[PDB]
Design an enzyme around this catalytic site. Sequence first.
Site, PDB file in Angstrom:
ATOM      1  N   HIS A  97     -16.025  -4.371  10.747  1.00 45.58           N
ATOM      2  CA  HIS A  97     -15.622  -5.691  10.298  1.00 45.58           C
ATOM      3  C   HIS A  97     -15.880  -5.950   8.809  1.00 45.58           C
ATOM      4  CE1 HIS A  97     -13.594  -8.799  12.336  1.00 45.58           C
ATOM      5  NE2 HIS A  97     -14.584  -9.672  12.482  1.00 45.58           N
ATOM      6  N   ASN A 128     -16.727 -16.154  10.548  1.00 46.40           N
ATOM      7  CA  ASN A 128     -16.027 -17.348  11.034  1.00 46.40           C
ATOM      8  C   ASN A 128     -15.875 -18.471  10.024  1.00 46.40           C
ATOM      9  OD1 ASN A 128     -15.056 -17.169  13.839  1.00 46.40           O
ATOM     10  ND2 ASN A 128     -17.203 -16.709  14.317  1.00 46.40           N
ATOM     11  N   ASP A 132      -9.994  -5.463   8.375  1.00 45.24           N
ATOM     12  CA  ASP A 132      -9.925  -4.407   9.375  1.00 45.24           C
ATOM     13  C   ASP A 132      -8.913  -4.922  10.397  1.00 45.24           C
ATOM     14  OD1 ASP A 132     -12.023  -6.441   9.555  1.00 45.24           O
ATOM     15  OD2 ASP A 132     -12.488  -5.624  11.545  1.00 45.24           O
ATOM     16  N   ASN A 187     -11.245 -12.926  13.908  1.00 42.14           N
ATOM     17  CA  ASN A 187     -11.817 -14.254  13.683  1.00 42.14           C
ATOM     18  C   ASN A 187     -11.860 -14.665  12.217  1.00 42.14           C
ATOM     19  OD1 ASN A 187     -13.871 -12.165  13.508  1.00 42.14           O
ATOM     20  ND2 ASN A 187     -15.379 -13.820  13.303  1.00 42.14           N
TER      21      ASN A 187
END
Length: 182
Positions: free
Chosen positions: A22, A70, A95, A116
């Site tokens: 991530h 987030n 990613d 997200n």
Amino acid sequence: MAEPLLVVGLGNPGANYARTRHNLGFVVADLLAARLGAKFKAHKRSGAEVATGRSAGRSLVLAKPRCYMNESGRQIGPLAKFYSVAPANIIVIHDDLDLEFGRIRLKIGGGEGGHNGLRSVVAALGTKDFQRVRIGIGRPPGRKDPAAFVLENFTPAERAEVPTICEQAADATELLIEQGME
């Protein structure tokens, strides 16, 4: 073309996430800043860290949210304004679960692919029409929850190619800046 460009690498702050799937966005942003010989600094009016430079005769602004994934979008909106950059000239590196490992693709608009970070950006910008440099990490094994998959490090085999892949993503970004999307 006189319009400034905002390149944003997504990821999670902190040593424990620097190598996770991530965080590829952070990795690529780090490369682009190094190539530009420009360094990052905390931006008082956004919360993200920023570096500025030139590419293809274009004015560049590289940034990495200091907030967790987030909350990424909330640090981008303010930066866009400070530099008065339009959504269309915002380039987000991330990613991508729907692209096989190491596969790089460009796009403006489209879905979030379960990312997200990408959703907080859409939510914050009020639009999906910003540029994206998608770096494929492939799908997660069945034994691993998607959200956990992206927060874990790359496998030994994948690890050996990540640096190379990021160079290519950095190159793609520069190329996208050169005459990108259309």
